[PDB]
Amino acid sequence: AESAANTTPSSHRLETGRVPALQAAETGATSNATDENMIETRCVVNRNGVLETTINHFFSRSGLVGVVNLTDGGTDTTGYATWDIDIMGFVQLRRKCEMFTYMRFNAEFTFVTTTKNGEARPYMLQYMYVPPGAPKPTGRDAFQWQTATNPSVFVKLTDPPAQVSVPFMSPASAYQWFYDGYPTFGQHPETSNTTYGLCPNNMMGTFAVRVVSREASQLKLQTRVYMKLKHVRAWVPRPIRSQPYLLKNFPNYDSSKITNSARDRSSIKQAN
Amino acid sequence: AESAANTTPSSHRLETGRVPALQAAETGATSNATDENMIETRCVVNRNGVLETTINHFFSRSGLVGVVNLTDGGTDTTGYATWDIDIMGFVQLRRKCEMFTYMRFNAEFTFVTTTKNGEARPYMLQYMYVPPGAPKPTGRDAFQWQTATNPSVFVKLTDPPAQVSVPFMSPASAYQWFYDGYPTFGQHPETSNTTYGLCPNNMMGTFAVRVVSREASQLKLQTRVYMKLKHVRAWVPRPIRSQPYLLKNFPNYDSSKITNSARDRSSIKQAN
Amino acid sequence: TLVGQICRYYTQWSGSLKVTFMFTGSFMATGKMLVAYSPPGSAQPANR
Amino acid sequence: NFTNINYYKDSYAASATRQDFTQDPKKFTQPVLDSIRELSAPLN
Amino acid sequence: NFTNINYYKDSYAASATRQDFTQDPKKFTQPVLDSIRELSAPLN
Amino acid sequence: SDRVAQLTVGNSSITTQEAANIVLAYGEWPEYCPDTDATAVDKPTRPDVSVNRFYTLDSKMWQENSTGWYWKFPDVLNKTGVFGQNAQFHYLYRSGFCLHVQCNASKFHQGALLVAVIPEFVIAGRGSNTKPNEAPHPGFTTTFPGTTGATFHDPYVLDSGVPLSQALIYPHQWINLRTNNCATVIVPYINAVPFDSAINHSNFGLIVIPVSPLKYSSGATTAIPITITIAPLNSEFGGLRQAVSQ
Amino acid sequence: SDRVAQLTVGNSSITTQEAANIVLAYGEWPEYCPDTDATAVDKPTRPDVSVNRFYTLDSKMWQENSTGWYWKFPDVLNKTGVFGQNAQFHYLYRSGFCLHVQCNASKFHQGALLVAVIPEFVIAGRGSNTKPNEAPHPGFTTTFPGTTGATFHDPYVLDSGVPLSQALIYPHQWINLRTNNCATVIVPYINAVPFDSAINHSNFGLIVIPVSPLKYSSGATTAIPITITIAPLNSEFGGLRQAVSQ
Amino acid sequence: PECFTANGADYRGTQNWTALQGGKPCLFWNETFQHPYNTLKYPNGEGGLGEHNYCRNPDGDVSPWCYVAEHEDGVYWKYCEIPACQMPGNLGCYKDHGNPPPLTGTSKTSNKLTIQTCISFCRSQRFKFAGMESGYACFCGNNPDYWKYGEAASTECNSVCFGDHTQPCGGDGRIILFDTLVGACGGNYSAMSSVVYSPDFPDTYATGRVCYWTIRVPGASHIHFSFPLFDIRDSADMVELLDGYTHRVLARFHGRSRPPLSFNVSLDFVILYFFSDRINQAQGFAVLYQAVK
Ligand SMILES: CCCCCCCCCCCCC/C=C/[C@H](O)[C@H](N)CO
Ligand SMILES: CCCCCCCCCCCCC/C=C/[C@H](O)[C@H](N)CO
Numbered sequence A, B: 001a002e003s004a005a006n007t008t009p010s011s012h013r014l015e016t017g018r019v020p021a022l023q024a025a026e027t028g029a030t031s032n033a034t035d036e037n038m039i040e041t042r043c044v045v046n047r048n049g050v051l052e053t054t055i056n057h058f059f060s061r062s063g064l065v066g067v068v069n070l071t072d073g074g075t076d077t078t079g080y081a082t083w084d085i086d087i088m089g090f091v092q093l094r095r096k097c098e099m100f101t102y103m104r105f106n107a108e109f110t111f112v113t114t115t116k117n118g119e120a121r122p123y124m125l126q127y128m129y130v131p132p133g134a135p136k137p138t139g140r141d142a143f144q145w146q147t148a149t150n151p152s153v154f155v156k157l158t159d160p161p162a163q164v165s166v167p168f169m170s171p172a173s174a175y176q177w178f179y180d181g182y183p184t185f186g187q188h189p190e191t192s193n194t195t196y197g198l199c200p201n202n203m204m205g206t207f208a209v210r211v212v213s214r215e216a217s218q219l220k221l222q223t224r225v226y227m228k229l230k231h232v233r234a235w236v237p238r239p240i241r242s243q244p245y246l247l248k249n250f251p252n253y254d255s256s257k258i259t260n261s262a263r264d265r266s267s268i269k270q271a272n
Numbered sequence C: 001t002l003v004g005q006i007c008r009y010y011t012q013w014s015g016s017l018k019v020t021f022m023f024t025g026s027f028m029a030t031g032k033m034l035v036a037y038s039p040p041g042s043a044q045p046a047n048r
Numbered sequence D, E: 001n002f003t004n005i006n007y008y009k010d011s012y013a014a015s016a017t018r019q020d021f022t023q024d025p026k027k028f029t030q031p032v033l034d035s036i037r038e039l040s041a042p043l044n
Numbered sequence F, G: 001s002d003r004v005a006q007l008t009v010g011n012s013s014i015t016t017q018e019a020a021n022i023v024l025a026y027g028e029w030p031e032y033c034p035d036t037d038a039t040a041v042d043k044p045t046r047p048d049v050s051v052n053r054f055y056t057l058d059s060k061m062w063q064e065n066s067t068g069w070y071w072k073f074p075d076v077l078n079k080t081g082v083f084g085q086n087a088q089f090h091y092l093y094r095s096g097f098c099l100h101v102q103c104n105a106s107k108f109h110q111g112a113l114l115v116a117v118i119p120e121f122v123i124a125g126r127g128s129n130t131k132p133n134e135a136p137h138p139g140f141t142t143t144f145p146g147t148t149g150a151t152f153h154d155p156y157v158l159d160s161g162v163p164l165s166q167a168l169i170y171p172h173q174w175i176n177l178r179t180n181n182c183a184t185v186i187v188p189y190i191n192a193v194p195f196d197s198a199i200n201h202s203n204f205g206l207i208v209i210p211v212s213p214l215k216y217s218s219g220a221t222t223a224i225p226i227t228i229t230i231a232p233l234n235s236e237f238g239g240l241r242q243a244v245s246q
Numbered sequence H: 001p002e003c004f005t006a007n008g009a010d011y012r013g014t015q016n017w018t019a020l021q022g023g024k025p026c027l028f029w030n031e032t033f034q035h036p037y038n039t040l041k042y043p044n045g046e047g048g049l050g051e052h053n054y055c056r057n058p059d060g061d062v063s064p065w066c067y068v069a070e071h072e073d074g075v076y077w078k079y080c081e082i083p084a085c086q087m088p089g090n091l092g093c094y095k096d097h098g099n100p101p102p103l104t105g106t107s108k109t110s111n112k113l114t115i116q117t118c119i120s121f122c123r124s125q126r127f128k129f130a131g132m133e134s135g136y137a138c139f140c141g142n143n144p145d146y147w148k149y150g151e152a153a154s155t156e157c158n159s160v161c162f163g164d165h166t167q168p169c170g171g172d173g174r175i176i177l178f179d180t181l182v183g184a185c186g187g188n189y190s191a192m193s194s195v196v197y198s199p200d201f202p203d204t205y206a207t208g209r210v211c212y213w214t215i216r217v218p219g220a221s222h223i224h225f226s227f228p229l230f231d232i233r234d235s236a237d238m239v240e241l242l243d244g245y246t247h248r249v250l251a252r253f254h255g256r257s258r259p260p261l262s263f264n265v266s267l268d269f270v271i272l273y274f275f276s277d278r279i280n281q282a283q284g285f286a287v288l289y290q291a292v293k
């Protein structure tokens, strides 16, 4: 259907037996009472489109995902800057994605790198994706930066932002943002269940970045990750969270200081 | 018709009854007296084109629309620079567009950004379009600049000017530059009717712009908006304004100090 | 409601809406109620 | 010579389409009900 | 207007494919076994 | 057989002796709203005998130092009769109009009148101030004059900054006292929306401006009234609710 | 499938749980006036969406010492909404009516109501004086109570000298609190003239009289309201003129 | 205090700059023959117009303003941000970002929204602070944290109201603050030195207003009064000052009486009375008092 719905011409009824406005809500179903079984309507040929409300047009937005700092000092230097790939770091795309239970999609990661004061000097960077199980690079001159049997992107700061496409690589058939279980067997404590809700089917490796040079470069870069979902399929729709987020991998909320879903009114017998 | 009009060969008439030069103007119609019903003409095959005088070739000009200042200071800074999208700020395109009552078109907005002294340094800008109803960004480091579920353009100063295409997004079926009414109900005053002529069907959101950096950038930019109309349809042609403009959303003119539509002559019985 | 949040993600809506009431009183309690929708215009009606 | 080719799924992002040579001038010049002939007195 | 052309051997690196207009709303609105008629009492 | 005409709408009739041809605005007849262009779901009402008739307004004495008068037509019949009552109770409105302006004189008077309609005739404030708080704006009695009417201050600029000379593009008619004594214009519904409120939005407005001044010799009659009659053709109303005045 | 019913007229709907069968008065449906029986020449108007809808009046608390209430139906909707406005501007009127009286209670209350219509329900004065100047006559608020209603003084004689017992010949319905909570009557246009003024002539009138008194044990609810809803089916209006109040 | 009106209509200051930090100088009111507000047109005051370049308000604007020099870039007039121009009862303007508001309480929108209608809306529900923005808003609340979004300039929040056109109703995304005690009808006053306004002070006072303002100080020697603003165009409505010990009248001032600007009275239980009429109403009073211990 390319349009929403057309309206049939209706009229009045004067007869017993037909009750379309007495739909019982105790059955768990939604009231199917239309306008034609009610106040007299007319013939309207609606041609309003429904294409924008689809899932592929709703999840085709990039949004901010990760912010990675790279100081590259001279005396307190590290060289590299890894970033665990997770979507729960910023509450916008998290709120947009946690309204479903199971999802399956592809990615269009984009990397925007700027300096501290803001300046595009021609410094070439190396963006490395470390899959889960591969060793992480330790140092700006490590052995792992050879990128043999490992995908990496070489780009400068004066160049346009890099953009790669990422397939679906979870060992399960779909992702999940809510895991009602435990990752392994054993006795689970009563004090602090810090492993509850953890899903090993979402650890998508680690993302590292360094500056390709010989000695050093006294510059503090700041990379931003923009992930565009595509080819997305969602299952089991879940309600939208009404409480402020507190942690990344845990949906914890405030016991006291609760936020009501609707703001307060003057009286119940007042519309304004 | 690809040409203007051809002329039929004519001759003289000596007979009573036929009066083609006595077209009455009291009926409200235009005199349809041709040259062939008058002084003896010849056969001319005119091949002058009429393509340039069409509406799509008349409104296919960019013109200046908006000028947005961005100081980005260090002590009296704001960071952002919003611009209400309206066409009444410069009288050239306004005079060209207010010769019709109802219009419907698309846009080809183009942004030319220069510095105060004039210089193209490689500073990346962020052009944001805020639709009507969305929150406006307050600060160069605000939450709204994430541009999730919001279109934005990232471009530098050394790059060519950005250019996007904008569809027809008025809730009515066409735009209007003259609204003979009031936006809401209620009692209207006699002192200052500041809401008369206001049309809510023309508020096309707000346009914002900032400098993508971390700390600051002591530079005063100045952006210019060039909007090219395309796919335009106009209704109910209106006369062209002969008085100088005074306000943006109001066609106010000077009561005293009136400008005549034609300049003065020496005498009426004199052509020069 | 969920429809309110979905309409909050967008900026323009159309089409008809449905509001469904449900009485959760006793079985022996009876009564009649008047649910009246009014188009735009003046403020909330004062009387029935 | 081909400018009728679009590069996107949306239709409003194209260029000027085929020009229309339609010119109805009689809805502004003679908006009258009784069709006044060319060789006649407009009022009798 | 052609965006169905891929430039690589892999299929996940393409753009949004043909849109599907499928809308099954009855699996959420009426998840009942006895099909409730439109003009009838839901319980008898 | 062209100078005489009898227009009949409802239970009213207008006979004429000195008439030009009737004017049909933009070559389109006023009809009902089709289902393709309509957007409301509720069924609109159509009296077709109680609101579709000739309503006669007051008469204005055409003097020698007269500038001109104008009207907001969906706002003049906002309180007069079944049409006004039916328009106060409803939220939506869509109709055309049939006009007739009467101005008779002898064969010894001279003068000419320009009667025309202007869609979205916006009244402009008169002043040379650009500060937002002191910029002059017209009052409610100036924007919507009601059944009485309003006069022009600068009729050369139509009180809107647009010259009167170029106002011949509109559906117009002349009243030349040596040719005819009436003018007739039939205008359809002209708006960018199918239906609209007939209380806070006037679609168009009549204007009468004497281009040639009224002249006569001492001894003839001196009271020359200007009478106007309006027929709201093909009226529709929707959104029945409480009656509001303004 | 008989105890449930949803009546839809215009943009209103009435749902029910405890209902008897709907009553059609005299077996005749309310329709439009045919050309054979009509007598006026002007064309009548038919909104059919703006006046044909359920209008809800006020609620009256059914006490234990209650006598009863009554109404003049072409005079109750004389000032409420588009129907009242359209009836003030017109001289002629002809329509049927659809009624619905709501009165709910628990399964521990007992009582019965007799709701019926009486064509030409004439209110009689109460007194034993035969002199013409002192013979008691009912006031205007007693003959035409308006949207509020009037109470009975002697409901055993229907305030007209006719016994309540014999009032079962009229189109009637019972509201027994153990059986149902509503009553529905559909009455057509009943008059000896095709059209008639809806201002100085009421065709019929509803009356509600509690035959069995309201009884309950100490501990239950005590406020039992009486709500009435009316739908002016198949309305016609003619003779458009100035609006008169009464 | 220098301004006792909601728009600074009576501000006789020595400010010849538009702002103290980051401002441009104002032009003189006698060298302004180009503009319709100069001393060649308005002699003998008329809002305050001499041979100075001070920030005045002769046109009945929402804030005092001067003439700045035109630098061929549009603006030829700027609002003056006077630090000492705030009526007692005006806390200032603040920023408004989103769903957590500065004022957590009731909200109300109307097409006729003045200062006193919003103050009365927040007062009829026993709220401590009122608030409005963008011309159509009324935010009530009792929270002390209303500066959570920052302090805004006074010239930034000069959007005109919808009901009246001489009052600033905040701005777009900027809320202006007001306490609910202003314009009220009576109240137990126990502060050291506060101001008492007439009923409906930002508006004109209503017809038939009568109330009792009570002032008690726990141990003050004698109290000092003042009359900054007084504008009555009638002789039927009038103000009184009474002592409630033996219930006798101290002084009776009306429209035909010019009250002295300052006097002492050796009392500690003064009560104020205001009997209005239903014929003529122009403006109220701004009685400031002071108790010395
Ligand atoms: C060459 C550098 C590429 C940088 C991007 C890394 C490629 C792998 C990305 C996998 C996409 C995973 C998207 C989200 C996965 C899980 O749901 C999250 N980790 C949990 O929220
Ligand atoms: C990504 C930045 C895009 C910047 C352009 C904003 C897109 C929306 C533009 C809408 C086009 C509206 C053209 C004119 C509309 C109304 O007639 C005017 N506001 C009133 O004159």
Ligand SMILES: *[C@@H]1O[C@H](CO)[C@@H](O)[C@H](O)[C@H]1NC(C)=O
Pocket (backbone or CB within 6 Å): H016, H025, H026, H053
């Ligand atoms: C403002 O007035 C003071 C008065 O003491 C004067 O010293 C100063 O020069 C004046 N400044 C300007 C800009 O007029």
Ligand SMILES: *[C@@H]1O[C@H](CO)[C@@H](O)[C@H](O)[C@H]1NC(C)=O
Pocket (backbone or CB within 6 Å): H028, H030, H031, H051, H052
């Ligand atoms: C305006 O007044 C000032 C102060 O008295 C004076 O210096 C100046 O010359 C005056 N300007 C004119 C044009 O009189």
Ligand SMILES: *[C@@H]1O[C@H](CO)[C@@H](O)[C@H](O)[C@H]1NC(C)=O
Pocket (backbone or CB within 6 Å): H262, H263, H264, H265, H292
């Ligand atoms: C009242 O007494 C005080 C002493 O505290 C004095 O300052 C003030 O001037 C006196 N008022 C008058 C009018 O003398």
